[PDB]
Structures are given as C-alpha cells and as structure tokens.
Ligand binder design. Structure first.
Ligand SMILES: Nc1nc2c(ncn2[C@@H]2O[C@H](COP(=O)(O)OP(=O)(O)OP(=O)(O)O)[C@@H](O)[C@H]2O)c(=O)[nH]1
Ligand SMILES: Nc1nc2c(ncn2[C@@H]2O[C@H](COP(=O)(O)OP(=O)(O)OP(=O)(O)O)[C@@H](O)[C@H]2O)c(=O)[nH]1
Ligand SMILES: Nc1nc2c(ncn2[C@@H]2O[C@H](COP(=O)(O)OP(=O)(O)O)[C@@H](O)[C@H]2O)c(=O)[nH]1
Ligand SMILES: Nc1nc2c(ncn2[C@@H]2O[C@H](COP(=O)(O)OP(=O)(O)O)[C@@H](O)[C@H]2O)c(=O)[nH]1
Ligand SMILES: [Mg+2]
Ligand SMILES: [Mg+2]
Lengths: 437, 431, 96, 50, 39, 431, 437
C-alpha cells in the first residue's frame, strides 16, 4: 500500500540502483528471475515487498524503478545481465546519444526526446500505485544525464504530481578528487534547480566512502561496487521502517517534517554504523552506545566535512535490529551531554529516534559484517556550508577565465543561468549563516 | 549506438589505417576473411560501431581509403588483413598530389572530393547515430594534408554537429623527411583549426624514441611504429565499444579537454611499455601505469612537458582494476606536480575506466593531453615558414597552380595567433 | 589461446562464402528494425559470465554469488485489516 | 573459395590486357563452378549415364 | 539455367574479350522458312 | 485472366525480345524444347500470360517477330531459346531496307503491315481477356521505327481500349550511332505520343554506365545490355505473373502514372545490381535497394533526373520483405528529396510488392518513373531535327518515298508543344 | 441464429477476411477442412457458431462470406491455400480485370458485369439465415474494387434490403504513408456515396497501426498479415456478443443506437489495446482499469488524428473475457474525473458497456499474447475531421491542375461527380464543426 517510486538517472544512479535492487531482492527473498521461491501459501499475507515490488498475476514481482540514461551502455548491460528478467522491458529506458558531462546538453537537447517517454512510464507506475507517497531519485552531481536530465525530470515531477516527498540521493564531488573538469559547473547548475524542487536531498561523495572502506572495512582495494553497496545499505536502512515492524516506525512524511527546519535547509548527511568487517566484529561488543558514538564521530561521516565545526540542528536515529529503547535513551543522553557535539540553541529536542525490529541483511560477496545493530544516522548539520564554499571556489576558478563556457554557450544555455545559479548558492550560504548564528 | 566513420588519406593514412584495422579487428575477433572468429559476444554487442555488417557473418568496416594515386591501395589489398575492406570505398585519383597542398586542395584533389563525399554520405546514411568522423591523415604532406583538410571542411559543413577527430603526424623537429613540409603543415593546420573538434598530433621522433630506448628492438622496423600508433588510436574509443566502469565518449573527452574552441590540439600516450628483456621485472599496476603516463619520455608528440603545463589531461584505463587506485594516483600527480599544472583549473584530469583490455595485456593505459608545451611544434613550424617565406622558397607551384600570397599571410596569422593563445593561457595566473 | 577471458569455444562452426551468399534464405525475422543490424538481440553472455568463477565485467558482479542468509522472515508487515476484513465473494444470506 | 580469394586480391583497376584477361578468366571459371555446384546442390540423387 | 542474374551471367557465343579464338563459327545458319509470300 | 501479346519489331526489338524470352523461360521453368522442367507449382498458374499451350504439353510464346529482312532473325532462330518460337509468327521481308522511316512507314513497311496485323490479330483472338500489347523497338531505325509505329497505329485503331506499351530504345545523346536518327526519332515519337500510353525510354550509354560503373564488366556487350533491358521487362509484369501482398498490373501502373495523356515517357531501372567483387561486401536489404533505385546511377535513360522533378514514381518489389520497411523507405526518400518531386500532387510514389523473386536473388526491384527530366532528350532531338531540316539535309530520301515537309513541320510542332508542357508542369507551383 | 453476413470486397478486404476466418475457425474450433472435431464441441446443442458459419449437414460448416475481387489473383490464393475446403467454390467470386485504382472502372464499367452475380450470392446467403443481424463490408478506400464496386454494392443493398445494419471496415489512407496517387480522388468519390448508405464506418489507416505494431507489440518490421490479424481481433471482439454469453451484451442495433447522435455522423474510430507481446505480458498484471485508460491515448488510437483536437461524442466499450462489472465502472469514473479528454456538452452520459465471458483466442503464429481481458472501444469523436481536412486539402491541391481526371472521364463518369463530392465533403466538415461546437 505504501508505494515508493525509484528513479535512477545517469550512470551513477543506475549503478547505485544496480546494487540497491540486488540488496532488495536478497532482503525480500525474490530471486533474480523475479520468482519468489515460495508463494501465497506460506508467509501469511506477504506484503513486505509492496514498497518496491509489485506482484503481477502468476507471482512475478516487478519493481517500481525507472532506469533512465542517455547513453545506451550501462543500461544495456542492465538489460543483459543477471537482472534481465526482473525489470520491465520498457522501464529500462535508454537514450540515443550521451549528454557527456554537460548540463546544457542534458537540459536543452535530446533530454527533451526521452522525457515524454520517461514521464509516461512514471505515470504508468504511479497509476499502478495505490497510495504512492515518495520518490527516490538516485543520481550524480558530476554532470550530463545525472545533472541536467535529473533536474529536468525533477522540475516536471514537481509541476505534475504537486505535493510529494521527492527524496534525492546525489553523488557529490569530493574536495581533492573528482573525475570530470566541468563538475563545478554541473553542481552549481543542478543546485539552482534542486534547491526549490527537492525535499530532503541526501548528499554523498566518494572520498569519505573510500576512507571508511580503508579504515573500518580493511579494504585495501575499494571500488564503486563497495561504494554502491554501502549506499544501498543506507537507503535500505532509511526505508526499512516502511516494510518491517518495530518499536517506532518512521515514514517519509515524519522524516521530512523532522529533518527540515526551514524550506531551504534540506541537505542532511547520512552516516551508517557500524561499517565494520567480520574480523574486527569478532573482537567487540557492538552495541547501542558505541554505535551512536561511531555515528557522531567525525571520522565516520560520509560527507567530507568536519561536524565538530558544525552547529547540528536536528538528526534522526534510524535503529535497525534488536535495539532496546532504554539503551537508546542512555546513548542519546550521553551524546547530548557531550560538549564537542554542538547543537543549535533553538532546537534542544533534536533527536528523532526510530527503531525497526528487522536486522540488516548482508549481501553475499560483500564487505560489511553481519551485525545485530545498525544506525542510519541522518543529521541536518551546518558543516555542509564547507562543501558549498569549496564548490563555489571551484566555480569561481572556472568562471574567472571563462573556461569551458563555450560548450554551454554554443549548445544554447546563456550566461544568465550561470549568474543566477551563483547568486542562488550565495543566498543559500547566507541562509546557512543566518540559521547558524 | 554511436557509429564513427573512419577515413585514411595518403600513404601515411593508408598504412596507419591498415594497421589500425588489423589491431581493432584482432581486438573484436575478425579473421583475415572477414567473418567472426572471436571469443565473446562482448566483442559483438557493439561491433557495428566500426563495421557495416552484411547478411550472415560478414563484418566489413566503415573505412574510406582515399588518395590521388592508386598505389598504397594495391599495397594494402596485397598486404595482410586487406581483403576485409570493401572494393566500393576505394575512391582514388590517377595523377598523385604527393606533397603539394595546392594539388591536394584546389587541383585534381578537388575534383575527387565529389565522389569522396558521395561515399561518405552513403556510409553516413547507412547508419542510425553517426557519432563522428575519424581521419588518420598526414599533417605536412600533399594528399594527406590538402585533401584531408578539404574533406574535413566539407564534412563539417554538411554535418555541423558531429565529433571530428583527426590523428595526424607532426612535422619533425630534427631531420626533415620532406623539404616543403612547413608550407604543407601550415596550410593544413590553417584549415584544420576551425572544423576538427580534436586533433591528436603524433610525432616521428617520439615513435622511434619509445621503441629504441623503451622497447629496445634494435632495428625497430615500421610496423611496430604503426602498431604503437594504432594502440592509442584503439584505446581512445574504448568507451564507445566495450562496457565497464565510468566511461568517456568522444564528446565527453572533447568537452573535458577543450576549454576554448581553438585549444583542441592534444598529445597522445600509450603506457604499458616494458622492454622485452625487463618485462618480467616490472609489476604492472595502476601506479606503474600512472608513472609511465606522467613521464616526459612516453609522450608521442615530442614537446618535453617540463617546458610547459598541461591544460587538461585525460586517462583511459582498460582492465579489471579499482577506482580508488586510478583516482588516488591522479590526486597524487596533481598535488605533487601542481607547479607543472595549470593553477586556475582545479582537477584538470579526466579518468575513464573500461574493463576490456587489448590483446596481450592484462591492463592497459591510454594518455591524452592538452598541454601548454605543444606550442613548440607550431612555433618551430611558424619559424621555418617565416624563414622560407622571407627568401621566397618553393612557391611558384602554388602561385601558378592556384594559390595567392594572401592565403599564406592568413595562414601565418592563424599560426602566430594560435601560439599567442597557448602562451597567453599558459602564463596567466588564477587571479 | 587462454586469452584475457577463457571461453573455450568449439571453433563456432564455419562461415564459408559460397554457403553464405548463394544459399538464399527468405527468412527475415520481424523482431528487428533492419536486416543488417542483426546482433542487437541475439547476445549470449548471461550464462558464461555466471560460469565465470570471477567475472569479466565490473557491472556483472551484483548477484554473482549465491544467497547466504535465510532472509529472516520473522518480522514482516503482514496486512490483516484491509486485506483480511474484505472477503471476495458471498453475501451471507444462505442460498441452498 | 580459392578462385574467389585469388580474384579478390587483384588490382584496384585492370587497365592492361593481361589484367583485363585475368579478371575475365577467373570470373568465367568461378561462374562455371557456380553453375556446376548449383546443379549439384539443387539435387539429391544424381545418377550417371554413359 | 543459362541466364543467371545475381552473379550476372548472360551466356552468349564465345566471342570477344578473352575467349575469342578464331572459332565459334560466325557463318550464318539456314533459316528454314522461306519468306512471307502471299504472291 | 490477364493477357499480354508480345510484338518485337526491328533489329534491336528482336534482340531484346530474344533475351526477354530467355530470361522469363527459365523463370517459368521452360526448357528450349517447350516442356516444364521446374520445381515450384507457382509457375503454372499464370504461365498463360506469356505462353499459350500447344500440341503435347508444349508451351509457345505469344510473340510476333517482325522485320523487313533476315539477319537477326537468323541469329534469333540459331541462338539458344530460339527454337521455342512458333515458326509462323515470323513476319519478315527481303528488301534489307533500313534507317528510313519513310521506307518503313509510307512504303513497303505498309506492304507487310496487313500480314503482321493478321498475325497479331490471330494472336489476340487466341486469348480470352487480352490485357494488352507489349512492343519492343528502337527509335532511330527503319524497320523498328516506321513499321513499328505503323503497327502501333493499327493496333490502337483496332483495339482502342487495352493497355499497350512500347519499350522504345531511344537515340543516344553522346555520339550518334546512326546518321538519320533525329529524323527517325522525331517521326516515330510523333506517332507514339497520341497512340501509346506507356513508353519506357531506354538509352544506350546509360546502360553502358550501369554495366561499367556498377557491374565492372570490362567487356560489356549487347548481351549484358539486353539482360539489363529484360530485367525491367520482367519486373513490370511480375505482379501479373505471380501473387503478391499488393498487386499492380499494367493498367494500374498506367492510370497511377499518367496525369495527362501526353505525359507517358518513363525511365526504367533495376535493383539490386552489384558487381561480382562487391557481392560478399554488400547486404541485400530494402534500404540498399531503395537507395540504389533513387540514385541517378541506375537510370536506363541517359537524361539526369537531378535537373528535373519526378512527376510520379513506381517501385515494383519482388521477394519476401516487410511492407512497413518498404513504404517507410519510400516515405523517407520522398521527404528527403522533396525538392526533387512535384509538389502539386501529394504522395507521388507507388508500391507493388510481389511474393516471388527471380532465380538466385533474395529480393529484387524495378524502378519505373515518369519524370520531367526526360524533356532534355526531346529538346536535343528537336534541336538536331531543326538543324538538319533548316538546310533540307537527308530529306530527299524521305520525300522520294511519298512524304512532304508538312509532316516534318507537324512533328516539330508536336515536339515543341510536348517540351513546352513539360516545362509548364515542372515550373507550375502548387498555389 | 443471430447471423451476420460478411462481404469482403477488394484485395484489402479479401486479405482481412483471410485472417478473419482463420481467427473465427480457431475461436469456434473448426478445422480448415470445415469440420468440428467431436472433442472440441461445447455439447448439449451449442449455438455459438451459427453467427458466422452455417451447417450443410454432414458435420461440415461453411462460412457466410462473400469474398469478391475483380482481379483473378488473391482470391486464387484463397482458393489454393489451406482454407480451400472451408469455402464453397461459388462463394469466391472473381471478375475479368481489376478496376485498377479507378473509381470509374469500379463503379460504372467493370463492376456492372458482376454486380448481379454478387447480389445473387448475397441474396442466397441471406435467405439461408433465420435472422440477420446485418452486413459486415470489408474494403479499402485506396481505389479500385474496394472503392467503386464497394459503393455500387452499398447502393444496390440499400435499394434491395434497406434499414438493415451495414457496418463497413475501410482501410483509410494514412496522411504521409500511402500507395497510389489517386487515393484522395477515390476517397472523395467514395465518401459521397457511403455517407448516405452506411450507418457505421470503422475506418483504419496503415501508419497508425504500423506504429501500434512497432510500439506495443514490439514488431518494428510488421506486415499486412499482422495488421490483418489485429483487425480480425477487433472484429471478433465486436461480434463476440452475438455469441458466448456473460454480462451486458451489445448487439448490432445496440452499439448503433448509442454511437450516432445524428444520421450522417457515422464515422467512429476503433481501439483494441491489450496488444501486449508474449515477453512483455509476463512482466505485467493486465488489469481492467489499466487497459481501460490505455484505450484512450493518442498513441493507441488507430487513426492518425489525436483525440485532444476534438470533443468526444460517444463511447461504446466492449470488454471481453474475465471481467467483473465493478472495476469497469470504477475505471470509467476515473476517466470521467480525468481532464485530459473532453466530452461534448449535450452528451452527459456517453459510455455504453458491453461485457462477455469468453477470453480472447490466440492464433498460433502471431505474437498476440494470451490475455484474459480485452477492450474493443469504439468512440464517435469530433477529432475525425482532421483526416477529412487532410484529404480535402490533398484533393483540392491535386484538382487545381485537373490531373488524373481524364482516366475517370473516359470511363463513364463526369466532373460533376467531382464537384458534388467536394461540396458533400465540405458540408460534412461543416456539420462536424457545428456538432462539435
Ligand atoms: N558512488 C558511485 N559514484 C559513481 C559511480 N559511477 C559513477 N559515479 C560518479 O559519477 C561521476 C561522473 O558523472 P556521471 O554520473 O558518470 O555522469 P552521468 O550521470 O552518467 O551523465 P553523462 O556524463 O552524460 O554520462 C563520478 O564523479 C562519480 O563520482 C558508482 O558506481 N558509484
Ligand atoms: N491493412 C491492409 N491493407 C491493405 C491490404 N492490401 C491492400 N491494402 C490497402 O489497399 C490499398 C491499395 O488498394 P487495393 O486494396 O490493393 O486495391 P483494390 O481495392 O483491391 O482494387 P484494385 O485496384 O482493383 O486492386 C493500399 O493503400 C493498402 O492500404 C492488406 O492486406 N492489409
Ligand atoms: N606513420 C607514417 N608516417 C609517414 C608515412 N609517410 C610519411 N609519413 C610522415 O608524414 C610526413 C610526410 O607525409 P607524406 O609522405 O608527404 O604524405 P603524403 O601527402 O600522402 O604523400 C613526414 O614527416 C613523415 O614523418 C608512413 O607511411 N607512415
Ligand atoms: N540493346 C541493344 N541495342 C541494339 C542492338 N542492336 C541495335 N541496337 C540499337 O538500335 C539502334 C539502331 O536501330 P536499328 O536496330 O538499326 O533499327 P532497325 O534498322 O529498324 O532494325 C542503335 O542505336 C543501337 O543502339 C542490341 O542487340 N541490343
Ligand atoms: Mg554516463
Ligand atoms: Mg486489388
């Protein structure tokens, strides 16, 4: 009944969803061909998967994701690989020619001649839905399909569906490391659109996940596979309260009305704990107090910023496993009485806890250990202004010599959009300063 | 699906393209006959990027071999892997331009161009995507230079929205290899820097150097040089053909490596390169590949890059690897040699990882770089052009066969304008 | 012989030119948009990349391993109100 | 296949008399072979008279 | 078949080209029918 | 049950009809003796269209051989598939008169016209429906032009309802090949215009160009030219002879193609024509067949269609293909060359798919098109005619066989009127 | 017992009937030789085959088909095909020569020699029926036998029988894809005569159904065979209420008293759209609501005119198969709440539902996946005036130069017919405009 539409835009979004649907199928028991090994005899009502999958007739569950991309490649091995049958053949919408790291090309060209088909697929999915409440736009801020077309689809979904919780999961460029050279341009241009259309946009870079894999996980060779599996674990811990019962169940409405103080500060940070490996998991007493401490550690943040320089407004604990609310109260009391973890003055009550009974599900061939306790700590801090200042400095370095502007200009997007996006993020930074003081 | 139409002009173009169609058809599994003696359907999924397959298992390519004299076409057809080419797209002239840009551009090279565009239009409308146009011509000759640039001008005029990549051999700093080479190269680059979205600038001292004292080889023949050119020629378009991790198409490389429109001359690099005796002493890993890339010797354009700064760098890795390896090695290169990088461009390195390496390599590495050190080539060519033009060197052919002195004047104007743009974007600071 | 990916194919028959040309087949299949572009559906990798002990694609690593856990069926949101208070057929009202 | 492979390796133009004759001799030989094995392949029995 | 179309054979008497051999007799043959004669 | 009576008059008409009865005999399974030595049953459903049954299983063609002389009658009788004709349908004279339209039309050509008309009359009453008459002749001869158009006029007078077409080998723009050709062509078209309603203009250097730049064929010869003509003979009536998805007979492709009565000069063609070398390198698909159709390098008339606009076009396909692909290809070529089409009628192309291909071909095609580019041939013939007539050259051999200058002036006025209305209907805008 | 007699005139009509009788024999369990096997009968004296097949008593059934073409071909394919012993040799009538895309030859010269014979066969096959539902004419407006001789047959049938239902199925010319050049002339000449004689004209064009086969049935190189099977499925679903029972049944007067508001407005459009292939039907739950609102989009109407540019007037929705009569009304209520479509003001109630119990029958050899639900919606809509405007523009644009006129003139028809057909179509367009406003 509690539907939720997942929309994977760009190569990063498609690969994140490729990990995510593997995790969802392993969690809910649906085999890669779409056929549950059991049927309606056992399992009782068997309505846990209805957030993502939809059983069709004989018993084949088809998910509620749209894999849309302008280049053919990655969605073709999605269509060809292990999950070829599980996805609907017209859900996996391909493009004709890649946007190729260009917001202008993703928003003023061939993105138009894919958007009607993807919108009609979205309407078909939502009319199949019977109580749809939220969207799961997974994409990247690197540029191209994941920025321009994702912004276009966000604008059209906002003007079509009206009020709807549109959760966004964005891949942010790290401070020292990024791939393309037009990532600053693409981030400023996509933030100008997603500032007023998204609702609780979660932000993740690659460097922090690499550091967590090297420190906690003992992975000397981390890669995009481990990155996307960790992000899949994050989103599974976010949406687990919809599908499994617990002491306190948290859905998207009370998620976003607790994590959004003002209708511009909607960029929280996601930290998972523990992200331990099995060897270090053997030598430990993994429990509520120390996983809250690991959540509030500055070394386990999944955005490359220092939360100790932050001014924490409101955070939600998402407990997953056999977690005792008394232990929750004790851990939150210790975190609140710690003094380096600084809260803002106008929100003393900034600890929204929600406990789910279902323990986390490990992926075979994975890296995370089996744990009886997990927290998806989601915090609306003020340390993201460091990221905004960094990317604004990168945009200024790009924009001083007007390098890489002629591609956008000859495509058709003008100088006014660059100026509007820069002044929009300047106003956003002054909004963080005004709310932080 | 992003087809790119391939084109060879001149003897240099014909031989380089012949070895390229040896290498990429060996990569995709095509036998000498033309059928599919491959190994996997991964090679067959995007095999129509380079090949207009017929009914059954025939896999002929979208290559147009063109010249003013039959010659090298008979040489290619007699040579190995020559029967794969279609007899229809062997359009040629009869006289032979040789090393005359006027004979390639205005005289009987300019009457062949109608049939050449007829074949180009046939192969272009026998497609559905038409990503772009590969040309492997010779920069500094006749039919390679003049007819090549005329063909580029016509193709950019009639399809003005496509990726245009020309590879080109650069006039030599040492030796000459051609006496009228500065005139030919200046006239070629004058028409080259308006239409080509990217020129790759391969050079015939670096090809001998990195096989004489990097690959040993004693007497290094010529097929090894052509194979070494075709290695990076195949490695550039790996994202268009083979799947894998984080990709970079031709338009992605163009938008990542061209900050301003007249800055699109790059330098290539292939960097698995171990000597035959010391192949087993090296540990082939991404740090070794990155060390071999960011090294003054390995660049196939001359232009010792300690004499300048890289504007942009793109690196295409090919193999089963980690992303943290490649990304951390590029971080290390940037933060270490930030003095030899452009300071007003943070993150001046594009990375692209495919997981299909070529034949005989577990791992592979392809370098391409827009540098503020490639102006030494153009500066030397402009200096040689001014030295000959002051004393009025070989010019009566051009003037009595259909040029003017004024055309040479705007050729030198674009010459010194381009080197001024390279110097001005080199010496500028961040603020 | 061993090559980068193993795939011990049995020489994949022959493609002789006489049989390819002059054995005319009036057997076009309508599943394509053009007769030449034949290798856009008949692609066979989905079982050999699973017969890999370690696969040749980074993207083909999501679900290569067999499942390990029992999915922990005990906590599931079983619907009892709006799927149990509604029974499909039959006004009570006996009819015998 | 042998005469087809030899015929495919000819020059791009046949302008001399031996080139023009060597094209036509191979063409006639290969089409006579085509007629021969077309008559053979169209049939299944093939009896031999005298 | 003597008049194939796909590998284009239009088989005529061995005249001209390579197969001219001062043979394949070019003397005209007897018609047999005399004429059209109402007179 | 439709029915065609074949009428071959003149030397060129006799040779073309000999090759036509060669190419459809093995299509319908007829041996030189007369029996049916074939496999498919589909060849004995409409075999009555071209051959009527005879004593003891023998099928004989419904053809009339027409001449003023022996010669190529001896050649046709001696050649293969020559002892298949009935020896009574052999109307021939003994003068040897030739290259004189007067001697063929107002002289002895009017002596044998009663005999050949009675032969054709017996041929016609040997039928039950008699769809029409199909005549082969050359414009620019004596026997095939004069006596031919005399028979055309007599047949039009005696059966003024049935479809009757001529295949009209036209004179040659390059060189002359016969001195009195403009006189013969002028006087022949002056009778063809009012009588015939389907004239397939076939030109000689167009066929030379096809046979040399399309099929290589260093020794082309009249055998290859006559097989090119015979292909488009069979391609028009393949829909009558064999079933198809969308049938179209001669009357349909007359009414669909003639907007006004003096607008019936077509430009035939054939596809797929490929060389022996470029046969394994070519894919036999519908887009290739369509582009080889609408390319100007397939026309059998030496006039170039780019200087005019097609009035109406027919594409009679043979073989098993896709209807959507075929008519989508015609839509694509129409919307591409919309400038090379008249805009005062919409959808000026015609499809006719037959379900039986010829021997050895997967698919085949026949392009026949009424276009306004045929006026260049008539302008050339009129200019040559007035150049000879302004000084009365070669006119006494016409006036000594019972003519006058009034007929020549009438023919010239008819040529100028036909050329003027071609000009009018090529520059006539929509509104 | 509720017999309806089918007259298939023209090549298109003969090919369509060649598919139609295949589908009918497969539905009723009739082998191609003409006999029902003893293990494929409903038993107990079933009567759900007499609406299309009579019974000359030997165990053999013969159809009520009046296959007519002026050319010797295609009907000879019918006579020599696998459906040879099914038809009587006198039911398959052929003429001397085809009318050859000429309305004048089809209506005045060639058809007069055979009109008496086809009228005699229609009289015999009508007298053999105890009760006649009506006539099912199948032809093409392209020209020739299917246009002029069809008009002659309709004039003669209106003279002879009168007041009986005469459904015609006309293969209309598409706007951009077409075969002949005199198709506008033939359509303009036919629609002057079929306006005063027919009472329901189901018109279909080739381009729209090419798009249907490419998009929904994923056959992007389809053919006339596949088009004929889909049209056969449409006519089977419309005649499935004179046979196998269920809920509300709609018969030959039932879907005509509620489809025409005014007499000369008898030009509706058909849409059968559970057209899902075999590989795409397994990954979808084919439900009544989603097929119901799928049969309302411009991408699924099989006439090249969008229904947005025009107000709806009447809709007769014919379900087929296992359909409950609740979710039909629920889906129609959702469509009534939808603002995308627009109904006319004088028709508040504008939906008529027919429902059967027989599931659709699959032909072995077509894609046409096995579905338990089907909709055969027929809407009378004002958007059909776009095709009239297009062909009238083509007609005037050709008639400006008076091209191709002499062929009609020298056959028995005069230009006054052209002028009066122009005036009649102008009046028809004006009447559609007045009814729509
Ligand atoms: N976490 C994670 N990030 C990825 C992955 N793949 C790509 N990315 C991110 O994507 C960025 C590059 O931009 P893309 O997302 O590939 O661009 P796109 O959305 O595909 O659009 P185009 O550039 O037009 O192809 C890189 O900086 C990566 O950080 C992945 O598998 N996991
Ligand atoms: N859907 C469909 N349409 C057809 C078919 N056959 C012909 N048509 C249509 O018919 C038009 C051509 O006119 P025909 O029906 O062949 O001619 P006719 O009505 O038989 O009259 P004649 O001219 O005497 O042959 C084309 O534009 C097609 O749209 C068919 O099998 N299926
Ligand atoms: N790789 C390669 N380079 C060549 C070849 N021939 C010439 N070059 C280079 O091209 C330049 C001269 O080209 P040229 O032979 O005049 O080309 P042309 O215009 O086709 O005759 C010289 O500087 C050479 O370095 C060749 O066969 N292979
Ligand atoms: N295609 C072809 N054309 C021929 C042949 N013989 C003659 N012609 C053409 O016929 C024209 C001369 O007409 P001719 O045969 O002398 O007419 P006739 O005197 O009435 O028989 C020339 O232009 C030739 O091109 C032949 O065997 N094949
Ligand atoms: Mg991408
Ligand atoms: Mg017909």
């Amino acid at each position: 009944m509690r539907e939720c539409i997942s929309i994977h835009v760009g190569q990063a979004g498609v690969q994140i969803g490729n990990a995510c649907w593997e995790l969802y199928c392993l969690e809910h028991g649906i085999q890669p061909d779409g056929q549950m090994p059991s049927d309606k005899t056992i399992g009782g009502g068997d309505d846990s998967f209805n957030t993502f999958f939809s059983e069709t007739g004989a018993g084949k569950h088809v998910p509620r994701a749209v894999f849309v991309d302008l280049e053919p490649t990655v969605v073709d091995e999605v269509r060809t690989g292990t999950y070829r049958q599980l996805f609907h053949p017209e859900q996996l919408i391909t493009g004709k020619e890649d946007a190729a790291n260009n917001y202008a090309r993703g928003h003023y060209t061939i993105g138009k001649e894919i958007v009607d088909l993807v919108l009609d697929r979205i309407r078909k999915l939502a009319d199949q839905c019977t109580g749809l409440q939220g969207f799961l736009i997974f994409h990247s801020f690197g540029g191209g399909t994941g920025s321009g077309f994702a912004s276009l689809l966000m604008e059209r979904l906002s003007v079509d569906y009206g009020k709807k919780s549109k959760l966004e999961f964005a891949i942010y460029p790290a401070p020292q490391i990024s791939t393309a050279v037009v990532e600053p341009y693409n981030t400023i241009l996509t933030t100008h659109t997603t500032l007023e259309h998204s609702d609780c946009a979660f932000m993740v870079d690659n460097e922090a996940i690499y550091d967590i894999c090297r420190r906690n996980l003992d992975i000397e060779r981390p890669t995009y596979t481990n990155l996307n599996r960790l992000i899949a674990q994050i989103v599974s811990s976010i949406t687990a309260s919809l599908r499994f019962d617990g002491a306190l169940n948290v859905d998207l409405t009370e998620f976003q009305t607790n994590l959004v103080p003002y209708p511009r500060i909607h960029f929280p940070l996601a930290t998972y704990a523990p992200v331990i490996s099995a060897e270090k998991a053997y030598h430990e007493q993994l429990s509520v107090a120390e996983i809250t401490n690991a959540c509030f550690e500055p070394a386990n943040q999944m955005v490359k910023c220092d939360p100790r320089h932050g001014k924490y407004m409101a955070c939600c604990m998402l407990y997953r496993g056999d977690v005792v609310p008394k232990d929750v109260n004790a851990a939150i009391a210790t975190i609140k009485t710690k003094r380096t973890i600084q809260f803002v003055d106008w929100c003393p009550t900034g600890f929204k806890v929600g406990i789910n009974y279902q323990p986390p599900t490990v992926v075979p061939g994975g890296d995370l250990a089996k744990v009886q306790r997990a927290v998806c700590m989601l915090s609306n801090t003020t340390a993201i202004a460091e990221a905004w200042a960094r990317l604004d400095h990168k945009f200024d370095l790009m924009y001083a010599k007007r390098a890489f502007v002629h591609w956008y200009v000859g495509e058709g997007m003008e100088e006014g959009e660059f100026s509007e996006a820069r002044e929009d993020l300047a106003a956003l930074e002054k909004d963080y300063e005004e709310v932080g003081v | 699906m992003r087809e790119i139409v391939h084109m060879q002009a001149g003897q240099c173009g014909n031989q380089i393209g012949a070895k390229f169609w040896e290498v990429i058809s060996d990569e995709h599994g095509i036998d000498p006959t033309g059928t599919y003696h491959g190994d996997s359907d991964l090679q067959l999924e995007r095999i129509n990027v380079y090949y207009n397959e017929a009914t059954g298992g025939k896999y002929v390519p979208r290559a147009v071999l063109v010249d003013l004299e039959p010659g090298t076409m008979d040489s290619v057809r007699s040579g190995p892997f020559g029967q794969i080419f279609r007899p229809d797209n062997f359009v040629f002239g009869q006289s032979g331009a040789g090393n005359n840009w006027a004979k390639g551009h205005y005289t009987e090279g300019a009457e062949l161009v109608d049939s050449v565009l007829d074949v180009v239009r046939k192969e272009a409308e026998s497609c559905d995507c038409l990503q772009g146009f590969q040309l492997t011509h010779s920069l500094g000759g006749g039919t390679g230079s003049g007819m090549g640039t005329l063909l580029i001008s016509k193709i950019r005029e009639e399809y003005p929205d496509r990726i245009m990549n020309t590879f080109s051999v650069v006039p030599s700093p040492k030796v000459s290899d051609t006496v009228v080479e500065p005139y030919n190269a200046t006239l070629s680059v004058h028409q080259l820097v308006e239409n080509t979205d990217e020129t790759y600038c391969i050079d015939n001292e670096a090809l001998y150097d990195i096989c004489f004292r990097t690959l040993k080889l004693t007497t290094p023949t010529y097929g090894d040089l052509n194979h070494l050119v075709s290695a990076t020629m195949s490695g550039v378009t790996t994202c268009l053909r083979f799947p894998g991790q984080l990709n970079a198409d031709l338009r992605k490389l163009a938008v990542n490596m061209v900050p301003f429109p007249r800055l699109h001359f790059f330098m290539p690099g292939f960097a698995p390169l171990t000597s035959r005796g010391s192949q087993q002493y090296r540990a082939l890993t991404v740090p070794e590949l990155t060390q071999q890339m960011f090294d003054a010797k390995n660049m196939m354009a001359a232009c010792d890059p300690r004499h300048g700064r890289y504007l942009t760098v793109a690196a295409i890795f090919r193999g089963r690897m980690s992303m943290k390896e490649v990304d951390e090695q590029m971080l290390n290169v940037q933060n270490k040699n930030s003095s030899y990088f452009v300071e007003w461009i943070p993150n001046n390195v594009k990375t692209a990882v495919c997981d299909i390496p070529p034949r005989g390599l577990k791992m592979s590495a392809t370098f391409i770089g827009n540098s503020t050190a490639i102006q030494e080539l153009f500066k030397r060519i402009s200096e040689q052009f001014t030295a000959m033009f002051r004393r009025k060197a070989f010019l009566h052919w051009y003037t009595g066969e259909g040029m003017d002195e004024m055309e040479f004047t705007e050729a030198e104007s674009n010459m010194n304008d381009l080197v001024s743009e390279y110097q001005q974007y080199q010496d500028a600071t961040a603020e | 012989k061993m090559k980068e990916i193993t795939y011990f194919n049995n020489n994949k028959k022959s493609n002789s030119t006489y049989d390819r040309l002059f054995h005319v087949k009036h057997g076009y299949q309508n599943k394509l948009h053009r007769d030449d572009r034949e290798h856009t559906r008949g692609l066979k990798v989905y079982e050999e990349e699973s017969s890999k002990a370690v696969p040749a694609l980074s993207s083909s690593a999501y679900g290569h391993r067999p499942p390990l856990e029992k999915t922990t069926r005990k906590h599931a949101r079983i619907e009892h109100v709006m799927k149990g208070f509604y029974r499909h057929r039959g006004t009570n009202l006996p009819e015998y | 296949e042998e005469i087809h492979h030899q015929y495919q390796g000819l020059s791009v133009v046949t302008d001399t008399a031996p080139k023009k004759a060597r094209k036509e001799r191979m063409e006639a030989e290969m089409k006579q072979l085509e007629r021969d094995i077309e008559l053979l392949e169209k049939h299944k029995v093939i009896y031999i008279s005298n | 078949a003597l008049n194939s179309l796909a590998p284009f054979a239009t088989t005529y008497k061995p005249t001209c080209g390579y197969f001219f051999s001062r043979s394949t007799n070019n003397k005209k043959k007897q018609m047999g029918i005399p004429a059209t004669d109402l007179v």
